[PDB]
């Protein structure tokens, strides 16, 4: 599915997100998942209060994520057709 591949493509860039917790996190993204796990660095948190903090490394659970906010160049990225028997989108030379 495409909504997951877009995420994997923003690895490296800086990302903003929102959790069920209520707080938003901002930082460089290192790894993601099909679950919607994340692995980030140099995070700058900002809760409901406005309280800023620093977190060196973080892992997440996707279940806990509400929504992400992604860089602007990631709208020209390709959105593929996928297929019935494939996990990752990718381009497809073969039959279909």
């Amino acid at each position: 599915s495409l909504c997951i591949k877009l995420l994997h493509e923003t690895q490296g860039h800086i990302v903003t997100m929102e959790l069920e917790n209520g707080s938003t996190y901002r930082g460089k993204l290192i790894e993601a998942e099909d679950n919607m796990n994340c692995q980030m660095r140099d995070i700058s948190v900002t809760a409901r209060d406005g309280r800023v903090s620093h977190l060196d490394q973080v892992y997440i659970r996707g279940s806990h994520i509400r929504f992400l906010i992604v860089p602007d160049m990631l709208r020209n990225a390709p959105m593929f057709k996928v297929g019935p028997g494939r996990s990752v989108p990718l381009p497809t030379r073969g039959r279909r």
Binding site: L2, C3, M36, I65, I69, P71, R75
Partner: protein, 98 residues
């Protein structure tokens, strides 16, 4: 199924979420979990606004969907002309008779 959902693709949408917040923008990509991707997004928390950009929502977070606006955006046949003329027929009467 998901036949209806492809029809919505590339329309400006109004998406209400479980939090109450409402996101707005075009729809680029769609999922089996209802993960939506949205372009040039704007929340309306309520007399309020914010600019985000590209937003990827989960399925858990989404409540309802609603279209705001519509989707954004044999050379030459044989025939030849001529000028005038309008010949007079000597005979009258129909074509087949005589």
């Amino acid at each position: 199924g998901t036949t209806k959902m492809v029809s919505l693709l590339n329309h400006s949408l109004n998406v209400t979420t479980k939090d109450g917040r409402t996101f707005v923008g075009q729809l680029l990509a769609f999922d089996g979990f209802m993960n939506l991707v949205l372009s040039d997004c704007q929340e309306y928390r309520h007399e309020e606004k914010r600019m985000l950009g590209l937003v990827i929502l989960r399925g858990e977070f989404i409540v309802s969907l609603s279209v705001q606006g519509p989707p954004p955006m044999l050379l030459s046949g044989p025939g030849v002309a001529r000028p005038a003329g309008r010949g007079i027929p000597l005979g009258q009467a129909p074509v087949g008779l005589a």
